[PDB]
Amino acid sequence: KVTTVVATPGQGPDRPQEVSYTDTKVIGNGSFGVVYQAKLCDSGELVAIKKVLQDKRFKNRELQIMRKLDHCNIVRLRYFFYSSGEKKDEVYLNLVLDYVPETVYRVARHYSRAKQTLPVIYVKLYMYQLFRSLAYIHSFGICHRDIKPQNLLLDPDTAVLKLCDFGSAKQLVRGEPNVSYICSRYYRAPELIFGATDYTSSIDVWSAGCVLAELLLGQPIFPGDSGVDQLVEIIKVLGTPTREQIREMNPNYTEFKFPQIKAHPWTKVFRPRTPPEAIALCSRLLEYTPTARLTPLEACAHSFFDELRDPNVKLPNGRDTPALFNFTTQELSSNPPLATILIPPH
Ligand SMILES: COc1ccncc1NC(=O)c1ccnc(NC(=O)C2CC2)c1
Known about the structure:
globular; 6-stranded antiparallel beta barrel; TRANSFERASE-TRANSFERASE INHIBITOR complex; transferase/transferase inhibitor; alpha+beta; GSK3b; binds the ligand COc1ccncc1NC(=O)c1ccnc(NC(=O)C2CC2)c1
């Protein structure tokens, strides 16, 4: 019935408290372990509890990263605690996160199975908030490395998006190599596909670009069950990466045989109804050269999102838009003058 734990609050000083929850249901499995849902007895609030085997030598990287994240577009770590259950003698870490009822993945698939497109206002809202969460985590040097629709939480009532699953997230340090095999099918940046170990946070941006494209197309823009098929799909849109473009990602994948194809016009990729600002944003996200891709903040400032900056804009359900402008010094640090655009007169 009721489970009572002594859990450490995610934020502030390490001062644990007796927390009680009930109504436990499984809502997710994964290589990481299990995600439960539960109801706090104190507030009646719903939480997701992510339970992962804790081993054993060092501190859990995900926990360390989530404890220092505080942002309206990032899933909130309310508590964490340790327990048993399964394995025995092996210890588990439980992350107690504020529950969010939907995902971009589930919402997009509703539209896709109805053979309809998500209305562009939602694309703008969701994409903008995704780029904020990225601008934020990148300001600490943290790369998410698994940006995909299922890791994008939504409250359908308020249209707030929250980035989750920091299971793959890492603090990227120049010159310290990182595993190339992160990030999920369709959303992998071409340098990851080429197995680069010196990649940057701009892989998060490529993935976001793939998410944007998918929301406009109603299906993944770069499908394929292997790297070589994805790469073909990318080359069909972007053209063949030059010897230099290859070099800017390549562990020398120069000299290899790539299908030669000229850059297909980006306007021809989407429905004719698709706003040009949407397409222009895509072509600035999905670039071969990682440094040529927009930074998350610059993307927030893109003209595609101007409607979000209209004082008269409202949600289709009649309510107001979430707080889109409460930028901090931290968030703006990669380009402070962009504040002129990011924060509208109201
Ligand atoms: C599968 O979800 C995850 C995968 C990996 N790590 C963490 C999470 N999940 C989360 O962190 C998480 C946090 C808060 N709410 C949800 N809600 C949902 O999933 C509803 C759509 C059902 C998931």
